[PDB]
Design a protein around this ligand. Structure first.
Ligand code: HEM
Ligand code: HEM
Lengths: 404, 404
């Protein structure tokens, strides 16, 4: 029966590899509308003209587990926006946390493997995560951030989105500035709770919206700042912490609102291809090493997952060149004082911004995680934590030793 | 940096497609030991000689969801055993339920799609399952069976395994018989509860064991039985139901016991390839259409999932030929009286083997599912259920109409 063989052969070739990271996700469609004037810093045609409208497609996701896993676990959430303009698609691959774990792109597979299930039993492994954290001290900021309530608080509608990098916005005269934009949720602070919530909201006629803002830094003032704006593991301070770092102001650009979901999930959402290399006229990448790695990695990954196999910029001074040359040196992969300064200030500022219960919950979550690892790794964890704050390490250890 | 590009390229090509069905699973190693004499019905070298021992490899799994999904959901569980004998690998691809949903292999993709998430929202869909059941009346037996406690009762250690087909065991003189073997659990009746249970049991020195039994049917007595032994949607009665069908006796063969888990899950368990076409000397397939489809489907599926792309039998009488010719006819895909007889007898015998609470639980489980489908499909479900038993349909409808 050739017909039965044809049916079975077509059925046998349906599934394709899932994404290396952010495998589980959901999609929707909407539009972007320009509401403010940014013509003095921008020349992108999509953002020129108040009331201009551009169609878009969005894909929300989780981070570390597989396609069928849960969405209410402690993790980072992603939001990838594809915009169809008059010059081509322009992609915004964003995260819901202002910073990232590492700053050296060569450490990415180790971080991903440390966040993946046990290589032998396919079960959860906190030990790999804590060993990675104790070996890499630039992940301390993100680790302290993720064990607060922020790691288990957002769904797809209440989460925000940060591009986390620096880009260059070039004017027609050859000048440019360092920029960083993000989206602020208008409606925010079972393995499919977030997916169900988003689709029910879209069904009941309520259209979620986001506010888009941009922060601008002059190239000649970047070398004189108190932190490296090319270091993706740090964040541009907007008013919370650290107190001694001046605030970088923001302007408003437009608004993004979502209307209608997918009709075929696999064809329209799963097989979508995003990449930071998708740019338009007026925007170029910065000198971030991780951005340079991402400019290559995404098309290469899509060649395997979706493959057939199944204006000259102006020149700056010598100070800018010296400041930029730091990203390619032996010391770039070694910790500095800021790697301990950022989590320390976050810990010190938690009680004032949220209260003592927030801090206590962070301590409890850290201890519950650390209670499942061997004793020597526990001692290493306490020693590493004492570098951020003595009180934090003391409390975490005193509360962990009563739970083993 | 060629080194960074090499690292990222190697990382980008790690994941491969998952299996079309039974994507989530666990593995272990053990051995099979022959304890009884079957030399009068068997010529397979693996089963000749008491005390003979053969290495083994097992892969347990769930049925309908993806790799990262849960294992405590209502589903069918599989157990695939690979044996390394002196003539080659011999595979036993088994299920934990004595029968299967359908009887015509051409309906397999529709059943699989009806059991898969919603094609547009990627959420659960009972409506597709109930529409499929109402369109195909040979799945009523399995549907009634699966909504009892048996659908949410077993883990990987307490579950049993049935090959569910008929095979031919050929003697050196050219004679043969129809056989059907199975494994009886010696120790039985969060998305990784069964996996964790199995690995913890293997970590404490307790080795799970299974008992292997065989049922033998003479070729000349098969045409005169009350049920088609070539129909995979029916089961060989061992003493429970139906009362009016005589019991087919069983003999003992050996025992299978498991010792050691995997060292690398992805390389040793995930990339394992099973197929009913893996046979040895002394065993040949029967005339089952679904078995014939499975003999082709599995290597074809493995060509895509794991591909480089990322003794003459004796002749029987005319009665046997006439009885065998039924599997290739227009009436094979249409329901008969037995498709309603089997679920009716199971329902009628449920009060006698487990009690009335078992029956009530089945009714409640059915109605919770039927409460989530539109009204016309509900009416169709009640009409279809009334063909098995009027009381069952009446109770299910009276309980469902109070929950919508
Ligand atoms: C060296 C650093 C990184 C590498 C090599 C990397 C690599 C990848 C790869 C290979 C994918 C799969 C995309 C596909 O197959 O289409 C992916 C997805 C994704 N990554 Fe990155 N990543 C890095 C860091 C980051 C950063 C800094 C962010 C956010 C600021 C991020 C956010 C995301 C998101 C949101 C997705 C989901 C895209 C989608 O839904 O298709 N990753 N990443
Ligand atoms: C026309 C009928 C059927 C077809 C076409 C079919 C097809 C498949 C396919 C394509 C796979 C994936 C295997 C691989 O990619 O290596 C699979 C796996 C499996 N099937 Fe079937 N199936 C059918 C009926 C059955 C029956 C009757 C049983 C049990 C009696 C069964 C039990 C299993 C099990 C346990 C696995 C897991 C194998 C593993 O762990 O690798 N299926 N099936």
């Amino acid at each position: 029966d050739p017909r039965l063989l044809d049916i079975l052969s077509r059925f046998n070739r349906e599934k394709i590899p899932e994404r290396a990271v952010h495998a589980r996700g959901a999609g929707a469609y909407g539009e972007f509308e320009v509401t403010h004037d940014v013509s003095d810093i921008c020349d992108i045609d999509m953002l020129l003209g108040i009331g201009k409208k551009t169609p878009c497609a969005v894909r929300f996701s989780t981070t570390a587990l597989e396609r069928g896993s849960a969405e209410s676990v402690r993790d980072v959430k992603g939001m990838a926006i594809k915009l169809f303009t008059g010059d081509g698609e322009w992609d915004w691959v964003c995260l819901n946390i202002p910073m990232f774990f590492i700053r050296d792109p060569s450490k990415f597979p180790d971080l991903v493997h440390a966040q993946r299930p046990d290589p032998a039993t396919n079960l959860a492994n906190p030990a790999a995560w804590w060993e990675f954290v104790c070996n890499n001290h630039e992940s301390l900021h993100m680790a302290v951030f993720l064990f607060t309530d922020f790691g288990t608080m957002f769904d797809y509608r209440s989460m925000s989105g940060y591009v986390s990098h620096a880009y260059k916005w070039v004017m027609p005269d050859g000048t440019w500035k360092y920029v960083h934009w993000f989206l602020a949720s208008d409606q925010g602070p079972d393995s499919e709770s977030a997916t169900r919530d988003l689709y029910q909201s879209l069904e009941r006629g309520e259209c979620p919206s986001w506010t888009v803002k941009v922060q601008v830094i002059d190239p000649e003032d970047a070398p004189r700042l108190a932190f490296n704006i090319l270091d993706v593991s740090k964040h541009w301070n907007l008013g919370n912490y650290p107190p001694d770092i001046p605030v970088i102001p923001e302007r408003c650009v437009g608004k993004l609102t979502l209307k209608k979901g997918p009709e075929n999930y696999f064809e329209e959402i799963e097989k979508l291809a995003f990449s930071p290399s998708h740019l338009v006229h007026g925007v170029e990448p910065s000198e971030d090493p991780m951005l340079q790695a991402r400019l290559f990695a995404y098309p290469d990954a899509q060649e395997h997952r979706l493959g057939p196999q199944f204006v000259p910029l102006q020149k700056q001074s010598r100070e800018h060149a010296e400041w930029v040359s730091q990203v390619t040196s032996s010391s770039w992969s070694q910790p500095n004082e800021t790697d301990y300064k950022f989590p320390r200030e976050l810990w010190a500022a938690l009680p004032r911004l949220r209260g003592e219960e927030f801090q206590n919950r962070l301590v409890v979550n850290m201890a519950e995680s650390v209670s499942q690892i061997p004793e020597d790794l526990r001692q290493k964890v306490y020693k590493t934590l004492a570098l951020v704050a003595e009180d934090l390490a003391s409390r975490v250890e005193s509360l962990t030793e009563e739970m083993v």
